[PDB]
RNA sequence: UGUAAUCCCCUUGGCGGUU
């Protein structure tokens, strides 16, 4: 019924494995004046309603380095918008959230490595940063083929 | 080395150096689109230098 | 199409990515392994489980 | 207190989160990450 | 991309065979008669040397992104 | 490696060096000073090695 | 000159060939991403009609 | 009462003759070739620096893919069966590879030869990757143009080809018995004629052709076996044909100690 | 508060000896650890 | 993502057994074997061996699925003989021939070296 | 004793896959 029969010795060696790219795309975008969105490694107390996900890959500028292993859910881009305070200045010892979490997460379904990181300025003047991601397939039950 | 230093050894290199790759691919294309807006404008003594000067950068290897 | 494009399975749990089935019942589905999808949904009741059993097996 | 590498003249530099995103040398506007200082390890399979 | 070390389908090593399968193609001698004489009797591992395309010397050209 | 440190001029004045005569027996002799010319890049020790910096 | 600007770029960008808030009663589809999973897939791309 | 003649022998391929046998145990033998002899292959590459135009773990696929000696794998250690920590040089063996292309013009290329053995077990001759000759460059690995370098450390364990298709001694094994089809084992597809439209065996000279008047045979059975043993250089073909035999005699005897123990 | 949370982590004994990966789940006793050389997530107790 | 690990094919776990034994009560003096983390290789051996013993009546086997790792034998003897001593009795004698096919190949070997 | 986090658009459009 149209399945076929694949040597698992000649897929060890090499046959029809294949290298998997998928690039992400952020930019810091103006609300106004004054109100940026900025590119950083956001913290559990400046920021409120944070991604379930791990930050510990973010660098310092809240982008992840290349050759670094990720999985799915994991935050590649790290991106806080400004939030105006509450009165939590009250009696707060300066740990009151001023930020909400905006990152970037990797898609639940795919992991890998990260291959490139862009780090540019788009046609605005603001902050403008790509992340390319590479995997290897190897053929396995229920892949498709064709001659 | 400081960082003032580093950016004045730069300076030095650069100011040094006639050449760098990437920015010779840039020259040649400025000059030939300056090229093309000379031929339009029926220009045929602009256009002879600037045949000349793209004789001289080019042949690459 | 028809009611036979429904029917109640025993689940065999097994390594890889592909719902497995017995050549006979790729007749009734009108299904071959060239790319298809199926669909499996999960009684979650005693009652429904004995529906599932008794009438559509 | 990051590298990074520029995309023309591959000339490596730092930012302080405050400079413009810019090549030191040549004003080029596209730079890169550099690699992580991490092990990286492989299956060879 | 680049010549692979095995031959797919039986394991014979190939990959030590492409600088003398180009060596002696440049000498005039027919693809057959070169694949002969570097012992590679199946036809398995014939279409390995026989149908590699070399794409590494096109990555190749391109400009190193550092230095 | 060091010839375009500012110090380098004093630094390399009253050195004593192996040269080249060219006209080949190996001399010594000594640094009365550094003079840059421009336009007169040379290749150092390889291609991209452009040297301005003159030993007088 | 944002006029013709905005114009070409939004018909190529999205397509739909007309003014913007014309976009009903438009031909849509007239541009389209490119395709480029192989070469042979893009090359049929450029001769459709 | 079993027998074995050889036909040629060389240090890759040896070509034998098997006959007082049953078939089943010279399936098991070519079977036990290839793919449960123990060898030696590389299995954990670490990259340090790599910034050729190939990704990473396309280098470590093709690494993994080149063949190390392990004529002495015998005395090595499974990696899961040595108590030390991490791993110790009784169970491992180190290699290093580093490369580098100097000068802005040319391509250099890496090859197999530069991978280095830098720790392994104490006067065991295993870990060296395999070379034809002594010029021989070995397998092409990887190329490099000015600025780019390789910088990798890799780590070869022993296992089996049933793990995974790098740890196979043998490359193709050649099996065939009864060229003449007097067991009448096949039957010949044809359009005219049977007999002038197939091409004889490479053996076929050596049993006499059934006779035209000779009645089918109904008591006989397969009983010589001809077969080509080739190697990838990592064990020679004698010691693929011996430690294959040595195999399948432990694995049968380990069966008969867990029937003897199990009462 | 489980210091060993989000810290590379290497294998001594069992099926992964020697293999980088990173600890993502500490509940206790049964340490979950992404291996970086595929791409899967395994179990492991904390002695090993 | 759900395929197994490779090692699983040979690799026994601790609490698995490599050899469990039930008798067959169908018929007399029969018994069924399950071998763990073994394939063809050791069956198909075993099972030809066995064939040609005058006491052994039926000998059979088979491998469930593909995608594990085992065999079951089917193994039934005369009155007179255990089918376990049957089993020792071949494993032994296919030993010995081994045994002797690796002494003579190693002759035939220096001879032609 | 310093104690770790829970949340996601919508509308159109195109291109595909299985029949
Ligand atoms: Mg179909
Ligand atoms: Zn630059
Ligand atoms: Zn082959
Ligand atoms: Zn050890």
Same mark, same amino acid.
């Given at each position: 019924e149209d399945s076929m029969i694949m040597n698992q010795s000649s897929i060890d060696r090499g046959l029809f494995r294949s290298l998997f790219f998928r690039s992400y795309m952020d930019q810091e975008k103006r609300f106004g004046i004054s109100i940026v969105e900025e590119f950083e490694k956001?913290?559990?107390?400046?920021?409120?309603?944070?991604?379930?996900?791990?930050?510990?890959?973010?660098?310092?500028?809240?982008?992840?380095?290349?050759?670094?292993?990720?999985?799915?859910?994991?935050?590649?881009?790290?991106?806080?918008?400004?939030?105006?305070?509450?009165?939590?200045?009250?009696?707060?010892?300066?740990?009151?959230?001023?930020?909400?979490?905006?990152?970037?997460?990797?898609?639940?379904?795919?992991?890998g490595i990260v291959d490139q990181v862009l780090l540019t300025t788009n046609q605005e003047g603001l902050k403008f940063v790509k992340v390319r991601m590479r995997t290897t397939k190897v053929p396995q039950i229920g892949d498709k083929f064709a001659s | 080395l400081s960082n003032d230093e580093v950016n004045s050894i730069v300076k030095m290199k650069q100011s040094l150096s006639s050449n760098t790759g990437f920015n010779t691919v840039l020259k040649k294309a400025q000059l030939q689109e300056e090229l093309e807006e000379a031929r339009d404008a029926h220009d045929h003594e602009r256009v002879a230098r600037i045949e000349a000067e793209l004789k001289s950068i080019g042949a690459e290897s | 199409?028809?009611?036979?494009?429904?029917?109640?399975?025993?689940?065999?749990?097994?390594?890889?990515?592909?719902?497995?089935? $017995? %050549?006979? +019942?790729?007749?009734?589905?009108?299904?071959?392994?060239?790319?298809?999808?199926? $669909? %499996?949904? +999960?009684?979650?009741?005693?009652?429904?489980?004995?529906?599932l059993s008794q009438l559509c097996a | 207190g990051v590298k990074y590498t520029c995309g023309a003249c591959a000339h490596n530099f730092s930012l302080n989160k405050s400079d413009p995103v810019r090549c030191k040398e040549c004003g080029h506007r596209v730079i890169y990450k550099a690699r992580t200082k991490r092990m990286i390890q492989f299956d060879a399979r | 991309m680049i010549i692979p070390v095995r031959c797919f389908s039986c394991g014979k090593v190939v990959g030590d065979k492409w600088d003398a399968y180009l060596r002696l193609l440049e000498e005039g001698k027919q693809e057959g008669d070169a694949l002969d004489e570097l012992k590679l009797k199946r036809y398995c591992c014939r279409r390995m040397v026989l149908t590699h395309v070399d794409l590494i010397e096109k990555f190749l050209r391109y400009n190193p992104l550092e230095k | 490696?060091?010839?375009?440190?500012?110090?380098?001029?004093?630094?390399?004045?009253?050195?004593?060096?192996?040269?080249?005569?060219?006209?080949?027996?190996?001399?010594?002799?000594?640094?009365?000073?550094?003079?840059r010319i421009k336009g007169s890049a040379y290749g150092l020790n390889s291609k991209e090695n452009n040297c301005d910096m003159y030993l007088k | 000159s944002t006029t013709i600007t905005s114009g070409l770029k939004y018909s190529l960008a999205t397509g739909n060939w007309g003014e913007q808030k014309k976009a009903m009663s438009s031909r849509a589809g007239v541009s389209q991403v490119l395709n480029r999973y192989t070469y042979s897939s893009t090359l049929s791309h450029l001769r459709r009609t | 009462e079993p027998k074995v003649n050889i036909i040629n022998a060389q240090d890759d391929e040896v070509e034998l003759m098997l006959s007082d046998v049953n078939l089943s145990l010279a399936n098991s033998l070519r079977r036990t070739m290839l793919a449960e002899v123990p060898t030696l292959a590389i299995d954990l590459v670490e990259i340090k620096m790599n910034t050729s135009v190939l990704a990473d773990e396309f280098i470590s696929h093709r690494l993994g893919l080149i063949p190390l000696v392990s004529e002495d794998?015998?005395?090595?250690?499974?990696?899961?069966?040595?108590?030390?920590?991490?791993?110790?040089?009784?169970?491992?063996?180190?290699?290093?590879?580093?490369?580098?292309?100097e000068g802005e013009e040319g391509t250099t290329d890496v090859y197999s030869s530069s991978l280095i053995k830098v720790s392994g077990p104490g006067n065991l001759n295993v870990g060296e990757?395999?070379?034809?000759?002594?010029?021989?460059?070995?397998?092409?690995?990887?190329?490099?143009?000015?600025?780019?370098?390789?910088?990798?450390?890799?780590?070869?364990?022993?296992?089996?080809?049933?793990?995974?298709?790098?740890?196979?001694?043998?490359?193709?094994?050649?099996?065939?018995?009864?060229?003449?089809?007097?067991?009448?084992?096949?039957?010949?597809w044809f359009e005219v004629d049977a007999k002038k439209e197939w091409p004889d065996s490479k053996y076929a000279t050596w049993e006499e052709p059934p006779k035209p008047g000779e009645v089918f045979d109904y008591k006989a059975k397969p009983n010589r076996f001809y077969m080509t043993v080739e190697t990838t250089g990592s064990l020679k073909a004698n010691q693929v044909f011996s430690r294959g035999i040595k195999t399948l005699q432990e694995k049968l005897a380990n069966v008969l100690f867990e029937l003897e123990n199990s009462r | 508060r489980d210091p060993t949370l989000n810290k590379t982590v290497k294998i001594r004994q069992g099926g992964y000896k020697g293999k980088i990966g990173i600890v993502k789940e500490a509940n206790g006793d049964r340490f979950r650890v992404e291996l970086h050389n595929p791409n899967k997530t395994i179990p492991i107790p904390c002695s090993f | 993502?759900?395929?197994?690990?490779?090692?699983?094919?040979?690799?026994?776990?601790?609490?698995?057994?490599?050899?469990?034994?039930?008798?067959?009560?169908?018929?007399?003096?029969?018994?069924?074997?399950?071998?763990?983390?073994?394939?063809?290789?050791?069956?198909?051996?075993?099972?030809?061996?066995?064939?040609?013993?005058?006491?052994?009546?039926?000998?059979?086997?088979?491998?469930?699925?593909?995608?594990f790792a085992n065999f079951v034998m089917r193994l039934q003897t005369e009155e007179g003989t255990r089918p376990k001593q049957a089993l020792e009795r071949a494993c032994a004698s296919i030993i010995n021939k081994l045994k002797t096919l690796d002494h003579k190949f190693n002759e035939e070997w220096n001879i032609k070296n």
């Open positions: 956001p913290t559990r107390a400046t920021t409120l309603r944070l991604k379930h996900g791990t930050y510990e890959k973010l660098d310092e500028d809240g982008l992840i380095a290349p050759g670094v292993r990720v999985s799915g859910d994991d935050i590649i881009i790290g991106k806080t918008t400004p939030i105006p305070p509450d009165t939590e200045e009250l009696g707060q010892r300066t740990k009151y959230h001023t930020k909400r979490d905006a990152s970037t997460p990797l898609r639940s379904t795919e992991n | - | 199409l028809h009611k036979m494009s429904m029917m109640a399975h025993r689940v065999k749990v097994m390594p890889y990515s592909t719902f497995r089935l $017995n %050549l006979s +019942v790729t007749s009734p589905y009108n299904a071959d392994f060239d790319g298809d999808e199926m $669909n %499996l949904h +999960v009684p979650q009741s005693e009652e429904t489980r004995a529906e | - | - | 490696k060091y010839w375009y440190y500012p110090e380098f001029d004093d630094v390399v004045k009253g050195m004593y060096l192996r040269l080249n005569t060219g006209s080949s027996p190996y001399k010594v002799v000594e640094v009365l000073g550094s003079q | - | 794998v015998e005395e090595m250690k499974y990696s899961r069966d040595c108590t030390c920590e991490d791993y110790c040089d009784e169970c491992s063996v180190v290699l290093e590879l580093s490369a580098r292309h990757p395999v070379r034809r000759d002594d010029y021989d460059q070995g397998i092409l690995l990887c190329k490099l143009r000015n600025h780019q370098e390789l910088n990798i450390r890799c780590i070869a364990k022993k296992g089996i080809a049933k793990e995974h298709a790098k740890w196979s001694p043998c490359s193709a094994i050649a099996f065939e018995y009864d060229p003449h089809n007097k067991l009448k084992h096949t039957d010949f | - | 993502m759900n395929a197994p690990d490779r090692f699983e094919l040979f690799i026994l776990p601790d609490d698995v057994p490599k050899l469990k034994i039930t008798p067959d009560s169908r018929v007399p003096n029969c018994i069924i074997i399950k071998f763990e983390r073994e394939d063809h290789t050791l069956a198909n051996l075993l099972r030809e061996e066995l064939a040609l013993y005058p006491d052994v009546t039926f000998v059979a086997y088979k491998v469930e699925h593909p995608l």
